Amino acid sequence: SVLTFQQAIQRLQDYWASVGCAVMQCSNTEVGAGTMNPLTFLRVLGPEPWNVAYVEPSIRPDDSRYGDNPNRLQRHTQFQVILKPDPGNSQDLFLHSLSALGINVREHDIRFVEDNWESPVLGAWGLGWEVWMDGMEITQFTYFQQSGSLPLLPVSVEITYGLERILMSLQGVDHFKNIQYTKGITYGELFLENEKEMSAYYLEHANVDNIQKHFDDFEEEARSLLSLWLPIPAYDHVLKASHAFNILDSRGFVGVTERARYFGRMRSLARQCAQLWVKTRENLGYPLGTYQE
Amino acid sequence: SVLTFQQAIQRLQDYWASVGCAVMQCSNTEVGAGTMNPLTFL
Amino acid sequence: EVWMDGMEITQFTYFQQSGSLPLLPVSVEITYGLERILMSLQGVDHFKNIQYTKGITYGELFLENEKEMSAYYLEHANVDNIQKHFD
Amino acid sequence: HGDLIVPFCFAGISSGNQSCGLRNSSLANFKVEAAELYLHTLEKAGILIDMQERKQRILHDSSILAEGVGGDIIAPDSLVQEVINLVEAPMPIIGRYDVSFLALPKDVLITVMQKHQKYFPVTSKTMGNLLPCFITVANGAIKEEVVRKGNEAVLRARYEDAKFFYKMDTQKKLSEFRDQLSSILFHERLGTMLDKMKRVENTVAEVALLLGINEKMIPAIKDAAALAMSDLATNIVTEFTSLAGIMARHYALRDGLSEQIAEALFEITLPRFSGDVFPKTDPGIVLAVTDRLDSLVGLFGAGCQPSSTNDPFGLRRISYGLVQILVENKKNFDLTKALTLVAEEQPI
């Protein structure tokens, strides 16, 4: 038969639940990507084991095209897998999962093409590849090297599945609405309500009076909370502070000189917030464990 | 054996997926209860 | 509400009205309170003693979003911004 | 070494006598009994270990596959050198796409094929334009039909976006694009590109007189700068960075202007990289040298001299282009007299 969208999740979760990962729920606040989740940015720091796989929507207003272009959307669903420490089978478990998903490996050109990921917004980088399957870029593979400003110890492995295009290339459809969510219903008839109205809001109806006064308010609140040794809400406010900057960029009311100021402020806040989680966790004695050699 | 929390979800989803329900993701904004979700009220 | 040996674990409800419109046709809502089902089934007495998976527990990874949140909601929630965000 | 193993451990790995071949293949991991019988074993597992041997099996089959449709492949060195080191056991496969994508410019299809998916374009021996074929390189032992059927669906998905962008970008003539380029900043102290273009079109007259070019050609130059470097705000160049400079020429030619100005518009960026061609028309030299001088003076006005390692703006590349243009064209010049004139129109 032909794979459907609502069971690819059921095959990508019950597999990683057998290796040893602990599956959890998605994010809470609107995350601009798949990495800024507090379950990945704050938890890779410090010597404790961490094996988590989950699924999250990602909203990016800058890539809003009224929901007509079959490649770019304002809400795409990603799958994230974080492994620490790397057990040595890093790129063999991925191929086993790919085989278990429903596609064969012996009859598809699965190759790795080098690609270095780096994001100055939160201060992170690493080395890795993107996985080409017959010319489609479907997966990002990355060994981390640095988060915020601390050096990682031990280094972690991140596997990011872009799940909206895997089925778009596997089923054989040409548009994106033609993806079938389940046997009987389709993806393009129930996930365009949160597409068309959101694109219209992000394009020409987003009132900019409130965004430019919520941004600084959130920054100040985050700083004040961080000064009181409260890490989790302090970082939570950073996400809704960084969403306002993206929505401002979408409308087009940010000049070419304020971009540096905004990036500097956000990265300084992220840097001074990251080095507080490590200091907070060390006083608890590292209940999860400790890594040696 | 004794049931665990992370597989009760796996048993409560694969069951209702066979009756005919369409399982979806959780809310986005902090919901004060389980009904005010836009997937049920609207 | 469904009683299982004295525990209230599920809410069952036929709707009749939402907002101000009358429902047509009426709908059925089944709400599982999933945190107490296992707390009553496994045999634990506290809530942290719930086990999330074979190897890890619920009370060692879902209290970070509990203790910090309770402190914020009790005596550190700055009320200057809430009463001007509401309107 | 010979028959015995050399015991030494590096990075927590002990050296032994096992080696792994193609993944998921029958020879997942094999044992080499003697170091003499090593290169023979790998070619038994299908791996073409030699670096230069793979070239003579890629280019010997890519040409053979071409004659089926009566054509030839295009093999830039910088493309084959990277295609070789991405495959363990090469296998070429041809594929087709619809002819309706031939209305696009010739330099867009080639860029899409060679800069993103790393394919091989096919050009006919007779009437040497593009053909509806391409050649890709698989890796290992894969089903032939599936790879082509899944690869043409990507190649005909990129071109839909390209054609939509082109159609939306040719709705208005090039004149209107000169106004909306202000969204591209040049320097935080100098400004955007509109000011740079206005300065260039103001100071082009003096430079056209220092080089000794005849007065009779002075009008056309004054018009070329009216549309100089306007492609940078177009849609087809927003994501295809390598196409900046030639798409302006294509738009100007379509607009219905003389051929003495399209070449000047195109040759405002030459040279683009080391080894590229140099300007060869008189009106283009003036624009090139004026742009180089203005870009040097403006960036030296804020004090941004690069060191030996970092290249904030690659001023050395600009200077090397300027001297190459001046020398390889046999034109008299006066540097210390033109620099003062160029610096006169600077805002500060």
mmCIF file of C-alpha atoms in Angstrom, chain D residues 4-244:
data_model
loop_
_atom_site.group_PDB
_atom_site.id
_atom_site.type_symbol
_atom_site.label_atom_id
_atom_site.label_comp_id
_atom_site.label_asym_id
_atom_site.label_seq_id
_atom_site.Cartn_x
_atom_site.Cartn_y
_atom_site.Cartn_z
ATOM 1 C CA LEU D 4 51.419 -10.320 10.803
ATOM 2 C CA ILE D 5 49.470 -7.323 12.082
ATOM 3 C CA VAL D 6 51.050 -4.133 13.431
ATOM 4 C CA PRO D 7 49.518 -3.621 16.915
ATOM 5 C CA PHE D 8 48.734 0.010 17.715
ATOM 6 C CA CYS D 9 45.598 1.711 19.032
ATOM 7 C CA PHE D 10 44.485 5.176 17.914
ATOM 8 C CA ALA D 11 41.382 7.020 19.156
ATOM 9 C CA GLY D 12 40.265 3.972 21.104
ATOM 10 C CA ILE D 13 40.373 1.713 18.031
ATOM 11 C CA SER D 14 42.678 -1.297 17.756
ATOM 12 C CA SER D 15 44.124 -1.961 14.314
ATOM 13 C CA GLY D 16 43.172 -5.341 12.887
ATOM 14 C CA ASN D 17 42.562 -7.202 9.620
ATOM 15 C CA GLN D 18 38.960 -6.354 8.717
ATOM 16 C CA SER D 19 37.558 -3.822 6.261
ATOM 17 C CA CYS D 20 33.996 -2.891 5.314
ATOM 18 C CA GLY D 21 32.803 -2.408 1.748
ATOM 19 C CA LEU D 22 29.532 -1.106 0.334
ATOM 20 C CA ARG D 23 26.831 -0.694 2.969
ATOM 21 C CA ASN D 24 23.907 -3.153 2.916
ATOM 22 C CA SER D 25 25.859 -5.192 0.368
ATOM 23 C CA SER D 26 26.787 -8.853 0.734
ATOM 24 C CA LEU D 27 30.360 -7.919 1.709
ATOM 25 C CA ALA D 28 29.359 -5.917 4.763
ATOM 26 C CA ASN D 29 32.781 -6.590 6.297
ATOM 27 C CA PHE D 30 35.530 -8.829 4.939
ATOM 28 C CA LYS D 31 38.788 -10.208 6.312
ATOM 29 C CA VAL D 32 42.047 -9.713 4.407
ATOM 30 C CA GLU D 33 44.389 -12.651 4.946
ATOM 31 C CA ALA D 34 47.555 -10.989 3.608
ATOM 32 C CA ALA D 35 48.507 -7.416 2.757
ATOM 33 C CA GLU D 36 49.667 -8.487 -0.711
ATOM 34 C CA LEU D 37 46.115 -9.500 -1.671
ATOM 35 C CA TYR D 38 44.430 -6.205 -0.815
ATOM 36 C CA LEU D 39 43.864 -4.111 -3.956
ATOM 37 C CA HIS D 40 42.504 -7.231 -5.647
ATOM 38 C CA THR D 41 39.948 -7.710 -2.862
ATOM 39 C CA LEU D 42 38.471 -4.207 -3.051
ATOM 40 C CA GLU D 43 37.797 -4.451 -6.784
ATOM 41 C CA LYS D 44 36.129 -7.768 -5.937
ATOM 42 C CA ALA D 45 33.766 -5.773 -3.706
ATOM 43 C CA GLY D 46 33.111 -3.296 -6.528
ATOM 44 C CA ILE D 47 34.987 -0.340 -5.028
ATOM 45 C CA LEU D 48 37.070 1.617 -7.548
ATOM 46 C CA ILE D 49 39.582 2.832 -4.987
ATOM 47 C CA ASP D 50 41.915 4.641 -7.401
ATOM 48 C CA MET D 51 41.230 8.369 -7.622
ATOM 49 C CA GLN D 52 41.993 8.854 -11.323
ATOM 50 C CA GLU D 53 40.457 5.538 -12.420
ATOM 51 C CA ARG D 54 36.930 6.713 -11.589
ATOM 52 C CA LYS D 55 37.245 9.626 -14.027
ATOM 53 C CA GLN D 56 37.915 7.261 -16.940
ATOM 54 C CA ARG D 57 34.779 5.265 -16.080
ATOM 55 C CA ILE D 58 32.560 8.304 -15.540
ATOM 56 C CA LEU D 59 33.549 10.126 -18.735
ATOM 57 C CA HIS D 60 33.672 6.905 -20.769
ATOM 58 C CA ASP D 61 30.016 6.094 -20.031
ATOM 59 C CA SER D 62 28.613 9.634 -19.954
ATOM 60 C CA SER D 63 29.724 10.164 -23.557
ATOM 61 C CA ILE D 64 28.402 6.748 -24.621
ATOM 62 C CA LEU D 65 24.988 7.526 -23.118
ATOM 63 C CA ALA D 66 24.909 10.803 -25.068
ATOM 64 C CA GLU D 67 24.897 9.287 -28.565
ATOM 65 C CA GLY D 68 21.544 7.622 -27.884
ATOM 66 C CA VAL D 69 19.941 11.033 -28.413
ATOM 67 C CA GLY D 70 22.733 12.367 -30.627
ATOM 68 C CA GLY D 71 24.519 14.834 -28.381
ATOM 69 C CA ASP D 72 27.392 15.561 -26.013
ATOM 70 C CA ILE D 73 27.901 16.343 -22.341
ATOM 71 C CA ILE D 74 29.282 19.468 -20.674
ATOM 72 C CA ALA D 75 32.128 18.706 -18.262
ATOM 73 C CA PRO D 76 33.496 21.692 -16.349
ATOM 74 C CA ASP D 77 36.589 20.722 -14.389
ATOM 75 C CA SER D 78 35.266 22.188 -11.128
ATOM 76 C CA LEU D 79 32.167 19.977 -11.481
ATOM 77 C CA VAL D 80 33.790 16.652 -12.378
ATOM 78 C CA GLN D 81 36.478 17.113 -9.720
ATOM 79 C CA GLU D 82 33.746 17.205 -7.060
ATOM 80 C CA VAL D 83 31.469 14.583 -8.628
ATOM 81 C CA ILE D 84 34.354 12.088 -8.580
ATOM 82 C CA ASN D 85 34.888 12.350 -4.818
ATOM 83 C CA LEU D 86 31.209 11.772 -3.959
ATOM 84 C CA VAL D 87 30.788 8.251 -5.384
ATOM 85 C CA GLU D 88 32.351 4.942 -4.348
ATOM 86 C CA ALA D 89 31.254 3.011 -7.469
ATOM 87 C CA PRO D 90 29.906 5.291 -10.210
ATOM 88 C CA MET D 91 26.952 4.434 -12.453
ATOM 89 C CA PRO D 92 25.539 6.995 -14.926
ATOM 90 C CA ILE D 93 21.824 7.218 -15.748
ATOM 91 C CA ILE D 94 20.126 9.558 -18.229
ATOM 92 C CA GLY D 95 16.784 11.270 -17.739
ATOM 93 C CA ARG D 96 14.328 13.434 -19.633
ATOM 94 C CA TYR D 97 12.203 16.507 -18.967
ATOM 95 C CA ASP D 98 9.548 18.418 -20.881
ATOM 96 C CA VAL D 99 10.540 20.777 -23.686
ATOM 97 C CA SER D 100 8.394 23.696 -22.482
ATOM 98 C CA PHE D 101 11.257 24.736 -20.182
ATOM 99 C CA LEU D 102 13.353 25.737 -23.206
ATOM 100 C CA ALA D 103 11.885 29.261 -23.246
ATOM 101 C CA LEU D 104 14.005 30.115 -20.200
ATOM 102 C CA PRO D 105 17.442 31.698 -20.697
ATOM 103 C CA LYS D 106 20.235 29.307 -21.605
ATOM 104 C CA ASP D 107 22.293 30.322 -18.553
ATOM 105 C CA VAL D 108 19.508 29.544 -16.051
ATOM 106 C CA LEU D 109 18.980 25.881 -16.929
ATOM 107 C CA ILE D 110 22.729 25.235 -16.772
ATOM 108 C CA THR D 111 23.032 26.987 -13.410
ATOM 109 C CA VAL D 112 20.131 25.024 -11.923
ATOM 110 C CA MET D 113 21.538 21.739 -13.234
ATOM 111 C CA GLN D 114 25.140 22.320 -12.170
ATOM 112 C CA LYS D 115 25.014 24.305 -8.909
ATOM 113 C CA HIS D 116 22.301 22.503 -6.917
ATOM 114 C CA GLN D 117 21.833 18.914 -8.122
ATOM 115 C CA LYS D 118 25.190 18.418 -9.917
ATOM 116 C CA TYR D 119 23.937 16.852 -13.145
ATOM 117 C CA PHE D 120 25.383 16.889 -16.661
ATOM 118 C CA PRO D 121 23.652 19.015 -19.329
ATOM 119 C CA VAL D 122 23.343 17.660 -22.862
ATOM 120 C CA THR D 123 23.980 19.786 -25.959
ATOM 121 C CA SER D 124 23.288 18.668 -29.513
ATOM 122 C CA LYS D 125 26.157 18.381 -31.977
ATOM 123 C CA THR D 126 24.081 20.235 -34.585
ATOM 124 C CA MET D 127 22.314 23.464 -33.574
ATOM 125 C CA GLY D 128 24.291 23.579 -30.366
ATOM 126 C CA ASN D 129 21.638 24.673 -27.885
ATOM 127 C CA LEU D 130 20.326 22.775 -24.871
ATOM 128 C CA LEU D 131 18.507 19.460 -25.228
ATOM 129 C CA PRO D 132 15.753 17.862 -23.098
ATOM 130 C CA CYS D 133 18.120 15.400 -21.419
ATOM 131 C CA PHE D 134 20.393 15.192 -18.397
ATOM 132 C CA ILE D 135 22.894 12.726 -16.932
ATOM 133 C CA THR D 136 23.155 11.864 -13.232
ATOM 134 C CA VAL D 137 25.516 9.584 -11.308
ATOM 135 C CA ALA D 138 24.160 7.005 -8.865
ATOM 136 C CA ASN D 139 26.249 5.238 -6.207
ATOM 137 C CA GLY D 140 26.498 1.457 -6.032
ATOM 138 C CA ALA D 141 23.988 -1.103 -7.326
ATOM 139 C CA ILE D 142 20.530 0.481 -7.460
ATOM 140 C CA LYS D 143 17.330 -0.142 -9.396
ATOM 141 C CA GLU D 144 17.501 1.772 -12.667
ATOM 142 C CA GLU D 145 13.850 2.765 -13.106
ATOM 143 C CA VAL D 146 13.197 4.073 -9.587
ATOM 144 C CA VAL D 147 16.122 6.509 -9.502
ATOM 145 C CA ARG D 148 15.170 8.139 -12.802
ATOM 146 C CA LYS D 149 11.460 8.241 -11.957
ATOM 147 C CA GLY D 150 12.246 9.902 -8.630
ATOM 148 C CA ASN D 151 14.959 12.258 -9.985
ATOM 149 C CA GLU D 152 13.046 13.728 -12.952
ATOM 150 C CA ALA D 153 10.237 14.655 -10.542
ATOM 151 C CA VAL D 154 12.714 16.915 -8.719
ATOM 152 C CA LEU D 155 14.265 18.337 -11.866
ATOM 153 C CA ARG D 156 10.807 19.268 -13.179
ATOM 154 C CA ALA D 157 9.924 20.704 -9.762
ATOM 155 C CA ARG D 158 12.819 23.170 -9.646
ATOM 156 C CA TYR D 159 11.984 24.485 -13.112
ATOM 157 C CA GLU D 160 8.395 25.319 -12.158
ATOM 158 C CA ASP D 161 9.707 27.703 -9.503
ATOM 159 C CA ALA D 162 12.297 29.085 -11.924
ATOM 160 C CA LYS D 163 9.703 29.717 -14.644
ATOM 161 C CA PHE D 164 7.268 31.319 -12.204
ATOM 162 C CA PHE D 165 9.996 33.675 -10.992
ATOM 163 C CA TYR D 166 11.004 34.535 -14.566
ATOM 164 C CA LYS D 167 7.409 35.210 -15.640
ATOM 165 C CA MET D 168 6.783 37.403 -12.596
ATOM 166 C CA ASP D 169 10.108 39.185 -13.195
ATOM 167 C CA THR D 170 9.453 40.043 -16.866
ATOM 168 C CA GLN D 171 6.089 41.714 -16.201
ATOM 169 C CA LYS D 172 7.795 45.120 -15.953
ATOM 170 C CA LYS D 173 10.751 46.450 -17.905
ATOM 171 C CA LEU D 174 14.155 46.971 -16.304
ATOM 172 C CA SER D 175 13.628 50.709 -15.756
ATOM 173 C CA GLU D 176 11.295 50.257 -12.782
ATOM 174 C CA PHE D 177 13.751 48.013 -10.915
ATOM 175 C CA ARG D 178 16.257 50.857 -10.476
ATOM 176 C CA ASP D 179 14.005 52.437 -7.829
ATOM 177 C CA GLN D 180 13.381 49.468 -5.511
ATOM 178 C CA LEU D 181 17.032 48.483 -5.001
ATOM 179 C CA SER D 182 17.239 50.499 -1.758
ATOM 180 C CA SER D 183 16.614 47.302 0.239
ATOM 181 C CA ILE D 184 20.238 46.283 -0.478
ATOM 182 C CA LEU D 185 22.777 48.011 1.752
ATOM 183 C CA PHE D 186 26.334 48.743 0.635
ATOM 184 C CA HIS D 187 27.928 50.065 3.831
ATOM 185 C CA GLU D 188 26.523 51.227 7.153
ATOM 186 C CA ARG D 189 28.323 54.566 6.750
ATOM 187 C CA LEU D 190 27.945 54.981 2.979
ATOM 188 C CA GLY D 191 24.424 53.685 2.359
ATOM 189 C CA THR D 192 22.568 51.575 -0.198
ATOM 190 C CA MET D 193 23.276 50.886 -3.888
ATOM 191 C CA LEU D 194 21.163 53.759 -5.255
ATOM 192 C CA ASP D 195 23.628 56.327 -3.916
ATOM 193 C CA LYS D 196 26.528 54.301 -5.334
ATOM 194 C CA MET D 197 24.911 54.235 -8.774
ATOM 195 C CA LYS D 198 24.172 57.966 -8.663
ATOM 196 C CA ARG D 199 27.792 58.703 -7.736
ATOM 197 C CA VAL D 200 29.044 56.443 -10.538
ATOM 198 C CA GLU D 201 26.801 58.066 -13.144
ATOM 199 C CA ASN D 202 27.893 61.501 -11.912
ATOM 200 C CA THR D 203 31.640 60.788 -11.989
ATOM 201 C CA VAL D 204 31.729 58.671 -15.169
ATOM 202 C CA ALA D 205 32.207 61.757 -17.369
ATOM 203 C CA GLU D 206 35.631 62.701 -15.980
ATOM 204 C CA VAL D 207 36.951 59.134 -16.113
ATOM 205 C CA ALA D 208 35.739 58.824 -19.705
ATOM 206 C CA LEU D 209 37.896 61.872 -20.495
ATOM 207 C CA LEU D 210 41.022 60.793 -18.602
ATOM 208 C CA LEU D 211 41.193 57.540 -20.581
ATOM 209 C CA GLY D 212 41.040 59.576 -23.792
ATOM 210 C CA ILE D 213 37.905 58.007 -25.269
ATOM 211 C CA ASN D 214 36.458 60.100 -28.089
ATOM 212 C CA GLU D 215 33.731 62.623 -27.316
ATOM 213 C CA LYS D 216 31.357 61.158 -29.921
ATOM 214 C CA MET D 217 30.740 58.116 -27.691
ATOM 215 C CA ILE D 218 30.091 60.196 -24.548
ATOM 216 C CA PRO D 219 26.246 60.187 -24.839
ATOM 217 C CA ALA D 220 25.767 56.411 -24.807
ATOM 218 C CA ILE D 221 27.985 56.026 -21.737
ATOM 219 C CA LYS D 222 25.882 58.608 -19.898
ATOM 220 C CA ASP D 223 22.854 56.433 -20.673
ATOM 221 C CA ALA D 224 24.419 53.081 -19.758
ATOM 222 C CA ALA D 225 24.902 54.148 -16.141
ATOM 223 C CA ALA D 226 21.195 55.021 -16.182
ATOM 224 C CA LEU D 227 20.524 51.257 -16.101
ATOM 225 C CA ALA D 228 23.845 50.004 -14.727
ATOM 226 C CA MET D 229 23.683 47.241 -12.103
ATOM 227 C CA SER D 230 19.901 47.103 -11.912
ATOM 228 C CA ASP D 231 19.623 43.306 -12.052
ATOM 229 C CA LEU D 232 20.598 42.988 -8.382
ATOM 230 C CA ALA D 233 17.006 43.774 -7.337
ATOM 231 C CA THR D 234 15.384 41.351 -9.793
ATOM 232 C CA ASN D 235 13.704 38.120 -8.712
ATOM 233 C CA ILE D 236 15.733 35.605 -10.732
ATOM 234 C CA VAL D 237 18.941 36.985 -9.165
ATOM 235 C CA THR D 238 17.706 37.141 -5.550
ATOM 236 C CA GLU D 239 18.380 33.420 -5.038
ATOM 237 C CA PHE D 240 20.684 32.754 -8.026
ATOM 238 C CA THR D 241 23.657 34.825 -6.915
ATOM 239 C CA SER D 242 25.956 33.571 -9.680
ATOM 240 C CA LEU D 243 23.678 35.014 -12.388
ATOM 241 C CA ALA D 244 24.239 38.647 -11.371
#
